[PDB]
Symmetry: C3
Subunit: 387 residues, 3 copies
């Protein structure tokens, strides 16, 4: 009996309304402090004498024996500057089995800067073969390195300092104009800045997200960082803007070694994010599929009234004639803009290209100190005597 | 003369079958991030000599290091007090004093925060024995990170050793062992918590790889689920019944990552970001194309419906076209139907993962290496002057 | 409604015109060279003798004393081969306090291959307790490892070589059939390739970005390996590539990056870059959802205008046999109850999206972390422990 029609409604077409996400792109003004170079110059030099003063009066004599030890003569600051420029180190006179009056060498002052060499290793000797006499052996080791080492910049009470990174995780703040010099046992160290700190007014792009877990993430060239306060530093750069740990002490992270396990952990976060993006790209593709179905239906409706529409859409010189709901034949027979879309420019991702520096202990300058220690152990392992 | 029939093609993307899930699971976590490692060492240098002149075959020295690693009860006391104990020192003790180098030594007669020995083997008293004894000792109490691990069907604490081995135990049972000069105590000042949770994962049913993969997030932890019973660092998971030889079997927590490995990971990131850039450019091109289609479409209907352009710009205007594109403007509870059927987009977000470092980098374990290096330096030569 | 008389225009509907971004996807043809396996075989062996030849003539005699020293006898290549297969090392005769005529063993050439053991550590002894006689002490250490070590491939003068990675950051390039053998102090080393380099013609997906500057870049994927192509002749880890060309650090002193340890600081910096990009993708996704929101508003208003004329349109959009009747601007009622296929016309001309995917990059660790090379350091450390003091107790005729 469906000669009669029924009526329901009224209805309305739903608009699409996504939950808003607040993160947005800011362009922050900042004063940026950077350096004209990315390395400090570490000059490290060492010098040690082995001094063995022995008396041989036979085993009955309680004075028979040896006073044999290492004595450190670390270079002074002036010496180290000359060692660095000449790539050579200096050492004292060698005494080989000196007895009698010649044995005084082991008792008097030692002049540690009488002979030069690029490197010098000592021989450990404590011979005592001359009965009723003292016997003296002296020999020297020395060496020097001049090596570039990376560094950080750092705010220290409202001024930008160079932060020299030490292999034990401590740091020493200083101005780019004041070299560091210190002595420790056999070694002296000179850290020099052959660069200056330049300041610039810059604009930094950041994404501020008030809905963490309030949090700003920024990019400056190949450097990426989370800005946590208005005075901020990252590696070689400090900024002023406008408007896990305790297993390692408070050691700088530049001396803590990453594990493969840490890389796996970072990799799995990447994997999760990329797969989510994959799922979201699938939904975006689905929306364009849906919009093409809606549009094709809408166009089919208007095109039956306006026989030029299809031709204008494909830029073909044809008018159309429909033979069904969807099938059609084709025959060949300056103003003011109004934006109805109001689209905002997309931010595009790009390859990050982060520079990596490695641990401070990996640097040649600092591993030179470890190599010096290892070589002393080898040469000291046993006496080179007739003893 | 006409051609056709034609039909408007619809856009048909190849389907991509990765989907978001909400999995139910039991999650085992712990109060604290760290175990407590107490490590203490103690060694005596003992040099027992006889000087009968070189004609006597008994002239010479029995000089050596002897280890007295602290017992469990001692290590507990060294831990709480931050001091170590050591025995009597003998400096050139001859005659009746030289017998201190014989028999049993009492290694716990004095206390110090730390103590290093001096190596001496003097023998200068003709016709007498001569005895030198000195001691080294030290203690550290250091937090060290751990993993949880399924053993049989229970969740154990996995203590990580610097050589890449691991020891599984309950959180309640401390580890204690002794090795040469050192004794080691691992205590857990925490308990394992049980909680029912829902974990968001993306399951990709066709993942290739030359051939079914699930990637999950739990807060700041991300992992690939590879079984129903699963652990990732400080947490173990039990999921419902739905859904390198160069290093030996070493725990990856002791293997150092190289800069080369970081470059490999960075290059992966760079490729994916550039592909995302290419895809964003295609997405922008599609919105460009849609705005051209819609403008042509609207311009056709707006000639029929002189109010339409007004509704599109929220204005009370009427329109009159003077050409195909150019126009003038004259001034002047329902049931929802959803024709779009859009699904919520998943949004990414900064994934701030915590890094732990190699076991060997931790202060607790490098204390062992530093004690070894310090003994080499003090033993380098005899102090007989 | 309306007062025609005056205003305004003419106006035109703006089209959306995005700034063009010029990174494009390529399939590059290349010759790829890979290997059957991902490890070389490092055989490393050491052997040393402690030899102490002493004379006791009392302290008045200037020849009283010792010639006590370590003497290295690194295995020959043939020895090393036998050590690796047997998993044993050889060493010479040992002498404990051999005095008088037996001290003869400390003189002349020592034969270092008389005994066998899986491993052997020496005792350091230089006793001299036999007055008016010589005394001889000899002992030996030896050890061997056979371990897999990872390697790179590398182009050397237009051929693919295997690149053996040494723990000091240098590398040795050689053909896969040329084993490496060298001797250094107490150690000899044999590096053997039990694999072949295989050639293959491939197509490689790359994204090429001609607008890539800092102050012309190509990023490729091949399986789980990702690399930036910097030249037509190019290697990445275990693979070398030759791309058709008509189609396209001071603190470490030039060491291979495979020996430079990554810091936690380095990881944080990469992590920070990931975070910035992901929050950018978040913001960009928000703009995408905004655009769909906006399109749904435009389409709804457009459909509302056409549907008043075409009462079947809405029924077709929801796939239902209904005609509509508008009762206001937005509100409407619904009333109910060969031969050739059509030629498709594509007005959209969308290109297929590239979809991201989890990258499962393999990590290799530092060379020094490998068991084969850490064996050398352990050998050195063990020698230091054994040599730390002489074990001269305690005998006498
Ligand atoms: C970066 O850090 C510096 C401080 O180290 C800030 O620079 C300061 O900028 C203010 C402007 O907001 C300057 O104050 C102005 O001084 C002039 C007279 O010199 C006065 O006429 C203005 O009314 C105002 O008081 C101030 O001199 C300047 N400080 C220094 C030491 O030069 C800056 O705000 C920080 N952040 C940025 C630039 O984003
Ligand atoms: C981490 O390492 C740094 C650098 O080695 C340590 O600081 C350094 O400490 C030494 C003492 O061991 C200082 O050398 C000495 O300085 C005094 C004072 O002038 C002098 O009398 C001595 O002759 C000797 O030269 C050295 O100056 C100092 N260096 C710096 C840059 O501060 C630091 O103590 C270590 N931290 C830990 C927790 O081990
Ligand atoms: C890795 O290190 C552990 C801990 O030092 C070693 O296990 C110890 O071995 C000593 C000596 O055999 C025992 O006295 C201890 O009881 C062991 N402790 C534990 C917790 O097991 C283990 O053998 C080492 N493995 C390797 C391959 O070096
Ligand atoms: C890399 O591939 C190219 C192209 O296949 C090789 O080019 C050959 O050598 C020269 C170009 O330098 C020309 O004769 C031809 O382009 C190629 N010759 C032949 C016979 O095809 C190039 O040799 C390859 N590189 C290596 C190292 O094999
Ligand atoms: C890095 O180590 C290699 C191997 O230990 C060094 O080269 C070997 O050592 C000496 C020096 O020339 C030669 O007798 C060997 O034959 C070398 N072998 C090989 C395979 O090269 C090399 O000199 C070291 N490099 C640095 C910069 O220290
Ligand atoms: C459909 O889109 C494609 C772009 O994806 C257009 O094809 C070529 O695009 C490249 C851009 O890399 C240009 O260099 C070419 O000039 C374009 N044309 C041709 C013929 O290759 C194509 O023009 C589009 N088709 C329509 C009808 O708009
Ligand atoms: C256009 O977008 C901006 C920001 O997205 C918004 O502030 C503004 O109100 C919008 N204008 C219209 C007419 O929708
Ligand atoms: C883990 O889940 C499985 C499957 O649901 C089941 O054996 C039980 O619920 C859990 N078992 C344990 C030991 O937690
Ligand atoms: C709407 O929801 C999903 C698409 O995400 C689909 O399963 C369902 O059939 C859709 N219904 C429609 C399009 O009417």
């Amino acid at each position: 009996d469906c000669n009669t029609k029924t009526a329901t409604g009224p209805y309305i077409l739903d608009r699409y309304k996504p939950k808003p996400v607040t993160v947005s792109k800011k362009l922050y003004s900042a004063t940026r402090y950077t350096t004209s170079a990315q390395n400090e110059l570490l000059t490290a030099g060492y010098r040690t004498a082995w001094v063995a003063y022995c008396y041989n009066g036979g085993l009955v004599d309680s004075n028979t024996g040896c006073n044999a030890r290492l004595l450190h003569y670390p270079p002074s600051r002036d010496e180290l500057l000359l060692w660095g420029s000449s790539h050579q180190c200096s050492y004292g006179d060698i005494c080989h089995d000196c007895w009698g009056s010649d044995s005084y060498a082991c008792l008097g002052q030692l002049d540690p800067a009488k002979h030069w060499a690029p490197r010098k290793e000592l021989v450990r000797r404590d011979a005592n073969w001359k009965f009723a006499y003292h016997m003296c052996n002296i020999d020297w080791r020395c060496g020097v390195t001049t090596s570039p080492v990376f560094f950080n910049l750092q705010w220290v009470k409202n001024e930008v300092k160079v932060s020299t990174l030490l292999p034990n995780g401590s740091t020493v703040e200083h101005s780019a104009g004041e070299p560091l010099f210190w002595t420790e046992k056999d070694f002296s160290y000179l850290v020099k800045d052959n660069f200056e700190i330049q300041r610039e007014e810059v604009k930094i792009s950041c994404f501020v997200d008030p809905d963490y877990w309030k949090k700003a993430f920024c990019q400056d060239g190949t450097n990426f960082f989370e800005v946590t306060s208005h005075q901020f530093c990252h590696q070689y750069a400090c900024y002023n803007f406008s408007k896990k740990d305790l297993p390692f002490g408070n050691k700088s992270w530049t001396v803590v070694t990453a594990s493969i396990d840490d890389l796996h952990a970072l990799s799995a976060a990447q994997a999760f994010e990329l797969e989510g993006l994959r799922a979201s790209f699938a939904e975006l593709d689905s929306r364009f599929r849906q919009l093409s179905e809606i549009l094709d239906t809408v166009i089919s409706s208007i095109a039956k009234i306006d026989e030029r529409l299809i031709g204008r859409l494909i830029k073909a010189p044809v008018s159309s004639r429909f033979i069904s709901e969807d099938k059609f034949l084709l025959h060949q027979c300056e103003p003011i803009g109004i934006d109805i879309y109001n689209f905002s420019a997309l931010w595009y991702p790009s390859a990050a290209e982060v520079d990596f520096r490695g641990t401070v202990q990996s640097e040649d300058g600092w591993s030179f100190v470890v190599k010096s220690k290892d070589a002393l152990i080898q040469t000291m392992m046993y006496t080179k005597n007739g003893g």
